[PDB]
Each structure stands twice: as structure tokens, then as C-alpha cells.
Amino acid sequence: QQQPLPVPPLLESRRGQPLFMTVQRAHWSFTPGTRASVWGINGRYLGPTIRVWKGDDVKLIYSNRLTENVSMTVAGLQVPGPLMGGPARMMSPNADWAPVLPIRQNAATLWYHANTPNRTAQQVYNGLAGMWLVEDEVSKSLPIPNHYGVDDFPVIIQDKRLDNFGTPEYNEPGSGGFVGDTLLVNGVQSPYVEVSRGWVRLRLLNASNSRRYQLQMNDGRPLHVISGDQGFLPAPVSVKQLSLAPGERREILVDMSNGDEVSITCSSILVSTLVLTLRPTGLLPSLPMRLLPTEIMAGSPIRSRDISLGDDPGINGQLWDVNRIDVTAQQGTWERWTVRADEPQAFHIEGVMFQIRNVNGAMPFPEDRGWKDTVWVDGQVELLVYFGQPSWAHFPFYFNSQTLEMADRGSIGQLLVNPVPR
């Protein structure tokens, strides 16, 4: 018998007031199993789901109540380098950080997490992560499920290794990324979610240190993808197996009208491949033919770049160097980036949005044709990157392996985006 899917509380303003985020040990009552502690935001394991609106200027007030330094970031958020932030905006124990974020991007499922240099893998694993939703006029008008915690749920996936009491424990891997043998969704092992007989929206986010998931429905039906690291696809895409690498987000719609139960499923070997069970209640209450009003146009790349990742920490043969700018781009411009990895892993770029143009010389799958900020690289990919945000030498954007331990080990590069205007 599984436990109910925990629904992170929705944290939004509306009154132009600040969103308070206290990084702290989770309450025992939110901690599994019953001995070791875990972390989160505001007393929870993991954090609340933030919801903001395109056009808002949101005041975030972070407070660090942990015994070590913590820097927090919103992955996929389009803001200037100094607002990201990272090591230059790190919070010492008991200190705070109150940035004002100008939300200007389209609707998307983003996420926030600790990005403390050297401690990212451990801090995210410990529970320093949560979902971040951007809503806009488009998402508000779409005929899709949107009642948060009713027919629209966050699905935060993490693979862990539990101690003798059922509490996730971390052991730094000697090589590569951390891999667990137990799946947790929103902090619970293979939970179920009770839904009515209609469409349900799941916002899938891979918040694991390194594991890449290959998701499918246990009854063989297709997964109807509607987004989108950086937003909606032009129209829904129905796939049999969905890849979800660390840091990727995809929103799917599941039709529970048949009144039957359906589960999403995925050494190294997992104790269970059960991700989330959609348990019908018998209650009664398609999909849209188009999501985005326009399959948005991409610009002409003025330059190309080549990025190489491997089984050894570093990018392009170099470890991350805070003093070194690896790429200098011009804001408002487009570039073609070729990313290669002989050791399969996800790749993330801060301060941009990109469209995958080719995967190993072939077309990318439909679910991968919208705007993104994270990509699974197994061989080579070609990206059409847009630099819509500015950054500065001491507040650069990072591009990195999404394998958390690898990033911690130096698989990070620095991107300077000269401001336009200036």
C-alpha cells in the first residue's frame, strides 16, 4: 500500500509582497523515516511550489537557517547574472538574500535549488529544491487542467539510497554521479495520487543527482507531452517512452476517464520502477490541438561554439575557473552550439533558452522541439541558443554538466553576455 503524493504548498504573492523562503532542517513530521534529518524550505522536505506571473517583479526573501553556506538559484529563470545568482550571492549561516526578480519569460515549469559551489550535489540531495511555476496569459486561457493540487501536480523525482531507518542518506561517489536504488516523488517512495475521471496534468521534474529516467505508462498508453523546460510545445506530442534527464522538466496530460488505475514507471538496479500511481476515485467532472498560438520563429545564428564534456570533470579540457570567461556572447543574439559528451549526461546553460536542432545528426524527437535549457547529451547535439539576458565578469552565467557531482568537481564553464542595451 502506497502513501499519498505530498502536494507542496503553493507560494505566491499577488499583493506585490515578498515570498519568504527559509532554508532549514525539515520538521520531523515531514521527515522520512524516523531518525535522520532532511532539509527543505519553510519546514518541509524540499520546498513549496512558487508561482509567479509573466510581467511580475517578484521580491524573494531567502533566509539560511542551516549550519553551512547556501546559495540558491532558479534553474531556467531568465534574469540578469547578478540575480541568479550563486557564489557571489551566497548566504552564510543566519544571513539572508532578498533579490527582486523581473519575470519576463513565457509560461513554463522551472525549478529552484541550492547551487552552493562544491556542495551542490549534497545540498540538492538533502532536500534543497522545489518547483517554480511561471504563468502567463496563454497558460491561463488554454483548455487544460490547471487547478494546482486538484488536477495539476508537481512530480519531483529523486533516486536515493535509504539508511536502515528509511531515511535517504548520501555517500559521495568516487567517480561519476550519485545513483540511488530507491525512487522518491515529492519526498515519498512510489506514492499514489487520487484523481477524478478526467484529464490530469503532471509537471515532471528530474531533481536527481545524475540518473536519467526513461518513463512510460504501465498499461502501454502514450504520454501526452505539452511542455517544455522553457514552455509549451506548439501542439501536444504523444510518446510511448519519455526521457527525463537531471534538470529537465516536461508537462504531460493523462486521461483518467476510463476509471482505471495507471502508473508511471521507469546496480544501479532500482528496488522498484514505480514512479507515481494515478489512483482513480470514480468521481466525474481534450487534448487541445494547439498549445502555443505560434510555432515561434528562431533567429539567425551569428556565431558557432563547440562544447565538449567527458567522464572526467571539466569542460573543453578545463576545470571551472571563477576567473575565467569561457564564452563571451552578445545579448539579443543567437548562436549555434555543438555539445558533445562521450560519457552520457545532461547539459544546462544559465541565462538562455535554446532549441535543439539536431541530435547526432538526426531530428530530435517532437517533445524536444520546444524551447529548452537542459539537454541530454549522448554523443552530440546541435543547439540554436538565444542570449536574452546579460551577465558580468563577476556575475557570469554558468553552463554545466547536470550530473551534480561532476558540476561540483569542475564540470562548469562561464558565460559572459554583454548587455544590450548598456
- Quick one: three-class SS letters along 356-418? EEEECCECCCHHHCCCECEEEEEEEEEEEEECCCCCECCECEEEEECCHHHHHCCCEEEEEEE
CA nearest 262: which of 214, 211, 202? 202
Q: How many domains does the chain have?
A: 3
Q: Which of 296, 313, 330 represents a domain boundary (last residue)?
A: 296
- Write the single-letter amino acid at 160: K
Q: Are residues 233 and 362 in the same domain?
A: no
Whether the CB-CB separation of 34 and 165 falls below 8 Å is answered with: yes
Shortest CA distance to 32 belongs to which of 222, 169, 142? 169
Alpha helices by DSSP H, listed for 272-364, are: none
Judgement on whether residues 157 and 242 belong to the same structural domain of the protein: yes
205 with 273, same domain? Answer: yes
**Cβ–Cβ under 8 Å, residues 140 and 97:** no
Give dist(CA 97, CA 91) in Å, integer.
Answer: 7
Per the structure, the complete domain to which residue 145 belongs is given by 136-296
CATH number, position 205: 2.60.40.420
Identity (one letter) of the amino acid at 284?
A: L
Burial (Cβ within 10 Å: 0-12, 13-18, ≥19) of residue 196: middle
Same domain, 263 and 373: no
Q: Tell me the resolution in Å.
A: 1.9
Experimental method: X-ray
| Selection from 22, 18, 11, 19 nearest residue 96 by Cα | 22
Q: Is the dihedral of CA 412, 418, 421, 422 positive or negative?
A: positive
Same domain, 131 and 189: no
131 lies in the same domain as 142: no
In this structure, are 260 and 333 located in the same domain? no
Distance CA 144, CA 201 (A): 8
Domain end marker among 105, 135, 165:
135
| Alpha carbons 403 and 269: distance in angstroms, whole number | 18
